[PDB]
């Protein structure tokens, strides 16, 4: 109930009762990672252009903690694009409308925000500096959006000798009113574990200049903790010289013919629809939020798969329980991109196969989005998901490109041979 308010306090924020990308009536999905309102329509293009560029949960349908509406209840959809659509005229603009066709829409969208075509341009390490230490979120997001890069570190003032990155900085001169902009940089510009000069990562810093609530929000976007520097002192180490206690107390806890009816889950965004229906059409196509289900049978080698496609959404993930019941075959889709939430999909996995009316499934899990930059390969999602240790059950990752197709027909069949 506490989050009640905040979610109320997110929509009346100014350009909020319109969508960000085609101004809607009202819009309930949120771009956690850039605090921005989109409808549902617009939403999909940015599930498409991944939680690299843009994390979309709903307002309606996901469980949002306090801490994921920092940004959304910090920006808006008024202050966003008078940075990201700054140079946009108000005559024929290519900005579409509530129900202009997908083909214009996702055009637009990833020009706004991938390519950063309609933004208030000029080049700049001196601004950026100024502006984070000024808390001036806003400009932040106009350095992003002339291709910054975070990554690579800035000259600083008076005897310069040393050097000093980004999120080092915004650490160190930080207060409760100065986080957004801490926030912004680690969803954004994520070298959330560089060591900088002398080795410190920025988790390390926060434990020197009594900095709690940036430590809170380091941990979140999951940081590594006891990585040494030049002194060879974990972050808990530097806690202790100048005894910052509250930090202290996070720090501790921081350190622990053939027919077959198949279903298939996963978190939002997982690919689950696109994986469906590519295999339906052979066509690429575009998908909205899944708020239902979705039904359809494919024939693939003279074998009838009746698939049970379920909205992963925080809230109709409860659902799932309903379709268990009759189900050969589970298809578990993972969005590998989405390092963020791997534990997260680790647990829902876990959460299925263990329960009752379930024991005699076979598990196809697809390793999804490979293509995606940072990809996390197939191995690598069998250890995280906690498959080294499972035994007396029938698994097998899968690589899968669903936007391609590459790896779908395989999964399958994997399944035409383990029914047997
Ligand atoms: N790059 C890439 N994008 C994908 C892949 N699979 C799905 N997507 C995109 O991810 C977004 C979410 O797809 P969707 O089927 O709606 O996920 P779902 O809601 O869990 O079913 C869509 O816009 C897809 O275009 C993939 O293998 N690679
Ligand atoms: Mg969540
Ligand atoms: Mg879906
Ligand atoms: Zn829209």
Redesign the pocket.
């Known amino acids: 109930d506490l989050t009640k308010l905040l979610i109320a306090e997110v929509k009346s924020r100014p350009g909020n009762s319109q969508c960000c990308d085609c101004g809607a009536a009202d819009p309930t999905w949120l771009s956690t990672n850039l605090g921005v309102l989109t409808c549902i329509q617009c939403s999909?293009?940015h599930?498409?252009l991944?939680v690299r560029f843009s994390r979309m949960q709903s307002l309606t349908l996901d469980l949002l903690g306090p801490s994921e509406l920092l940004l959304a209840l910090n920006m808006g959809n008024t202050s966003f694009n008078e940075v990201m659509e700054a140079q946009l005229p108000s005559h024929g603009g290519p900005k579409p409308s509530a129900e202009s066709d997908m083909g214009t829409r996702r055009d637009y969208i990833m020009a706004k925000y991938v390519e950063h075509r309609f933004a208030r341009r000029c080049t700049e390490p001196q601004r950026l500096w100024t502006a984070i230490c000024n808390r001036d979120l806003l400009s932040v997001l106009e350095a992003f959006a002339n291709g910054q890069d975070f990554g690579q570190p800035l000259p600083g003032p008076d005897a310069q000798a040393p050097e000093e990155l980004v999120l080092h900085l915004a650490v160190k001169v930080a207060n409760q009113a100065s986080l957004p902009l801490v926030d912004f940089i680690i969803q954004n510009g994520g070298h959330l574990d560089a060591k900088a000069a002398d080795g410190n990562t920025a988790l390390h810093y926060a434990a020197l200049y009594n900095q709690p609530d940036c430590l809170k929000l380091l941990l979140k976007g999951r940081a590594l903790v006891g990585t040494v520097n030049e002194a060879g002192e974990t972050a808990l180490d530097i806690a202790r010289k100048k005894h910052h206690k509250e930090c202290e107390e996070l720090l501790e806890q921081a350190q622990a013919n053939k027919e077959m009816r198949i279903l298939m889950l996963?978190?939002?965004?997982?690919?689950?629809?696109?994986?469906l229906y590519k295999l339906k059409l052979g066509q690429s196509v575009?998908?909205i939020?899944?708020v239902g289900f979705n039904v359809e049978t494919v024939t693939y080698k003279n074998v009838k798969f009746n698939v049970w496609?379920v909205?992963?959404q925080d809230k109709i993930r409860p659902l799932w329980r309903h379709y268990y019941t009759g189900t050969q075959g589970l298809i578990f889709?993972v969005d590998c991109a989405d390092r963020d939430r791997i534990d997260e999909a680790r647990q829902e996995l876990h959460r299925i196969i263990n329960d009752r009316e379930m024991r005699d499934a076979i598990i196809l899990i697809f390793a999804?989005?490979?293509?995606?930059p940072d990809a996390m390969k197939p191995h690598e999602i069998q250890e995280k998901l906690g498959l080294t240790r499972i035994r007396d059950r029938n698994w097998y990752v899968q690589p899968?490109?669903?936007?391609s197709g590459d790896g779908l027909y395989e999964g399958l069949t994997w399944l035409t041979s383990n029914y047997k």
């Open positions: 999909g293009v599930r498409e991944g996963g978190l939002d965004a997982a690919g689950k629809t696109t994986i575009t998908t939020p899944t496609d909205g992963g889709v999804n989005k490979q293509d995606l899968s490109c669903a936007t």
